[model samples]
Target: ATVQQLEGRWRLVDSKGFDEYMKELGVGIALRKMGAMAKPDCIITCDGKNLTIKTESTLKTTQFSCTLGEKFEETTADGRKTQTVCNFTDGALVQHQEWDGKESTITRKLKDGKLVVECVMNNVTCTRIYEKVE
Candidate 1:
């Protein structure tokens, strides 16, 4: 239940409530449809305090790299520019992303040998389960 345990490759195997989560984020209908249908591989790598999260899917591929507490600007999968920060908290890497006045969060935790990802915006939440691959 530590950050070191999360340093591994994770492949998405199951997801739930993603469409509703996208809707809550105000994603366009077309993009929401495409996003819901695509499966993403969440690859995580770490070097001491530096971390990188890469998402690879059939429709899009995105990567983000940062030190533990650095605030950086990133282009999100939905194509919005946002200020992002990641922190290892209570056995999870909690990522906070904000664009304009809106914000969302993603929690990545290593639980029972799986990397469980949860995303939240407004009242909608999505859970994506990943299995270790490498």
Candidate 2:
């Protein structure tokens, strides 16, 4: 039930972003520094056929929930909100996020026995890896 545990709810434990992805996301220098050094928390859960994910950091917290293959809105914990959609790509869950009407796609998968989430925009790719607890 490890995956099911992941399916129910998850808290962010840590995050890493590629340089270009960081810049494209408009992350400020100081905040990026903090993001690089601090370990944030996130939680993901499933409500029947829908999935809900919430992330928290020293600077902000955000929540997102949606059904597979459907689009929805997401508000960042830091207050920057946007529209997004999550779907299954090659059997893995992927997300397409839009901020200020600009679109970015992200893929989530398990690699090397860990959860890996990657986001791409204009060919810039950023990724974060997560470990399961309990």
Candidate 3:
């Protein structure tokens, strides 16, 4: 088994401020409600120079890949098209997105062996914590 910060299989343990965070991004109610209610598993895998993240939820499954400092197009589960770029800063992996005249930020780090993901839109921030699998 391989163990590393921000890499491996992780299951959602808890989430905070998701509702307001989605609201800040103008997410529709149907998707917003499902997003908040569904527990998602995030699978992160990296090799050589590329990193990929797969978000699995009951409503949708979306995958995206990024290289540090390179921009890529991402179609969010809700169908918004966003340009995304990633960076590693201060021991955390930071991702930025811009779409439809709006923007957002997401940061990931390890805390006490748990994957901590923070989603920030405008001023609202949502925190999601995930636990390791096995």
Candidate 4:
């Protein structure tokens, strides 16, 4: 889907398979509990050909602005330095990331008026569903 279609605020609703996934990411027990309890708000804005995504939660807030298919460096909230590239595939915004000799993929898509974020790493997959808020 186009960036324009994704411009809005979405509230985290349901998530599955995240605890194990966070553990796989090397997150500490305390932080993993915090992360599991967080319900982040994802705000998206599109300007011209670029998209800005802001994720806000009580624990942390992370922001990124990027154009499709362009590579960029990001330091995740959990303190990992990753190289990321995003592109649209099959109507979803697909992101590929590499860090610390490991690889991961995240796919964000609008489905039935909701936003679905699917994250996969090392054959493990986690899906977080977000509902449109505005």
| Per-prediction backbone clash count | 0, 11, 0, 1
What are the models' TM-scores? 0.93, 0.74, 0.91, 0.93
What residue runs in model 2 are displaced by over 4 Å at the alpha carbon?
Answer: 1-16, 77-79
- lDDT by residue for model 4 (10-119), tens: 99999999987888899898879888999999998877668788999988888988887889997776778899887777888888989979999988999998999999
Give one digit per residue, the lDDT tens place, for model 2 in 1-134: 23333452333445555656767778788766665665556577765558877766666666777886676777653345677777665656777777877777777676665667787878788777777655
lDDT of 3 by residue, 1-134 (tens): 12246788899999999889888878898999888888988999877558899988787788988787899998877777899988777888888999878889999998898999999987899999999995
lDDT of 1 by residue, 1-134 (tens): 66778877788899999988888888898889878788888788888789998888898889989998899998888888999999999889999999889989999998888999999988689999999986
Give the Å shift of residue 40 in candidate 4.
0.6
After superposition, the stretches of candidate 3 with alpha carbons farther than 4 Å from their true spots are: 1-4
- What candidate 1 gets wrong by more than 4 Å, as runs, is none
Against the true structure, candidate 4 reaches a TM-score of 0.93
* Superposed model 4: Cα runs more than 4 Å off: none
Clashing pairs in 3: none
Using lDDT as the measure, the top candidate is 1
